[PDB]
Amino acid sequence: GLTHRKFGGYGGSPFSGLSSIAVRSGSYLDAIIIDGVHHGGYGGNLSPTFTFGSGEYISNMTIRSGDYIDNISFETNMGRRFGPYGGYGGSANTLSNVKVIQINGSAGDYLDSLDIYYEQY
Amino acid sequence: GLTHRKFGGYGGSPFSGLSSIAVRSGSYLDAIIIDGVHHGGYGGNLSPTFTFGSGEYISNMTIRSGDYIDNISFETNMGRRFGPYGGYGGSANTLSNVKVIQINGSAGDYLDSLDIYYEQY
Numbered sequence A, B: 001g002l003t004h005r006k007f008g009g010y011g012g013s014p015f016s017g018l019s020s021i022a023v024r025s026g027s028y029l030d031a032i033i034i035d036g037v038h039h040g041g042y043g044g045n046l047s048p049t050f051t052f053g054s055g056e057y058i059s060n061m062t063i064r065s066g067d068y069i070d071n072i073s074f075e076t077n078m079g080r081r082f083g084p085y086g087g088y089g090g091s092a093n094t095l096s097n098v099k100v101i102q103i104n105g106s107a108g109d110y111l112d113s114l115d116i117y118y119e120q121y
């Protein structure tokens, strides 16, 4: 199943493939914007972009979802916060004391689903 | 440890936060560009950007590395290829029959290392 491997030396400043997040939101999440790439539809309103610093990652996250994503907010290991953006429907689920590695999902006119890959601490 | 959790419904078309890849390479890799975000220096020659289709993932990847990332190639589940780009020093390692979830790492003037997160099948 899920794993990871490292290749190379020890120099450099760290980076993540997950470098920035923005959303379009109304009552739902219309779309998530990952590293500037638009995923979803064009309804709702565009949030400001949250950009991860070096060594910074999502450590806590709350997601309201039904058959779509309703609301997202998160906190990073350096105490910065994004959201809540979205509406009040759906049921809330929370990831606590994690390191988020990736956000995949599924989208149409709205953000239907999010498949969050993370380290649980 | 590593895990993942899905939120939301069952509609829409799938997407990945790992949505495009380019490299800058000479005798090794000067940089990797993930979703248009530049990780590393500006030396070497800039490969074309490989952009993943919906539902497309790296299913096979070969990396040559020493103190630095020296070469990258990969193949996707839709039968498309990327690379090899880079030189032929270092030691080769292959991720075979996988689904790549995320590419993190460390870079400076050059691409020092990659942390590849994936599912092994």
Ligand SMILES: OC[C@H]1O[C@H](O)[C@@H](O)[C@@H](O)[C@@H]1O
Residues within 6 Å of the ligand: A025, A026, A027, A028, A029, A030, A043, A044, A045
């Ligand atoms: O988020 C779903 C939906 O919410 C509201 O009704 C409006 O802001 C729409 O633009 C948006 O599409």
Ligand SMILES: OC[C@H]1O[C@H](O)[C@@H](O)[C@@H](O)[C@@H]1O
Residues within 6 Å of the ligand: A107, A108, A109, A110, A111, A112, B010, B011, B012, B013
């Ligand atoms: O995104 C909401 C809805 O939008 C479109 O109509 C299609 O992609 C559906 O499959 C999806 O569920």
Ligand SMILES: OC[C@H]1O[C@H](O)[C@@H](O)[C@@H](O)[C@@H]1O
Residues within 6 Å of the ligand: B025, B026, B027, B028, B029, B030, B042, B043, B044, B045
């Ligand atoms: O990639 C290693 C190195 O190879 C060559 O000497 C040039 O293309 C450099 O710009 C590059 O950094």
